[PDB]
Design a protein around this ligand. Sequence first.
Ligand code: C2E
Ligand code: C2E
Length: 209
Amino acid sequence: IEIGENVLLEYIEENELKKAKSKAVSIENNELLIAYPVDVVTGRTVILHNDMEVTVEFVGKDEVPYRFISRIKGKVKDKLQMICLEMPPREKMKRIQRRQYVRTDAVLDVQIQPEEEIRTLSYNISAGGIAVVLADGLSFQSGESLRLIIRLPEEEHTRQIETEAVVRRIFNDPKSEKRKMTLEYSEIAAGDQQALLQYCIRRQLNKRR
Ligand SMILES: Nc1nc2c(ncn2[C@@H]2O[C@@H]3COP(=O)(O)O[C@H]4[C@@H](O)[C@H](n5cnc6c(=O)[nH]c(N)nc65)O[C@@H]4COP(=O)(O)O[C@H]3[C@H]2O)c(=O)[nH]1
Ligand SMILES: Nc1nc2c(ncn2[C@@H]2O[C@@H]3COP(=O)(O)O[C@H]4[C@@H](O)[C@H](n5cnc6c(=O)[nH]c(N)nc65)O[C@@H]4COP(=O)(O)O[C@H]3[C@H]2O)c(=O)[nH]1
């Protein structure tokens, strides 16, 4: 559970599966109150018809994602229109895991090249994707295929991993006002990917104690 966190809904309206993003207000007794149901892609608000079985997703205080089916109990009026969601038990609230590959926060040398060539740094990495800090002026696009070269330092032997990856998303970090960008490996060698895989596990393992 948490408060103020994002509550992601997934319902069926007019035979197609629509998703929406709301905000946790309170979880009094067995009822969850969410506010401002806006569409996941459309910034404009939406309407959740009562008694509609929805599928609620959220990230708890343990940085673990949770998913449960529920129902629109009804509207609640106190100063705004908030939607009442019937909460399940504490069982029947399945913890999910959407990442195929284990991620680790590592500042690695990344070289992006589509005009010239951009040598930059990553801020987290995975065996299937990468997230990289951009400088101002760099113009890319979600869906553009880029060739990037990753300097993976597997101890003394510095492995150079060359892949092609497609831009997932570009956003502005509210903590640094610097552009960040994420990519998914379009094509990566089996040898390099396995090494990159064992690197992220050991690196994540080396900080448990
Ligand atoms: N579309 C998309 N967005 C991404 C992805 N990775 C990160 N983000 C965005 O970045 C936020 C912070 O992620 P984080 O620092 O890894 O911190 C995350 C992460 O540590 C944890 N978490 C959430 N879902 C998963 C998961 O499926 N697997 C794992 N291992 N951790 C998760 O909860 C934190 C909060 O996640 P959110 O509230 O979702 O907020 C996420 C999400 O909005 C991605 O692969 N796809
Ligand atoms: N290192 C790194 N790699 C990134 C990031 N964003 C995307 N990627 C790469 O791109 C793949 C596709 O992510 P997606 O299309 O957002 O699709 C995502 C998203 O829909 C969902 N997902 C995973 N983690 C999160 C999360 O933390 N928050 C949310 N909201 N969704 C997530 O599962 C899919 C992720 O599958 P993956 O095995 O993670 O595979 C990811 C990952 O390899 C990032 O911030 N850092």
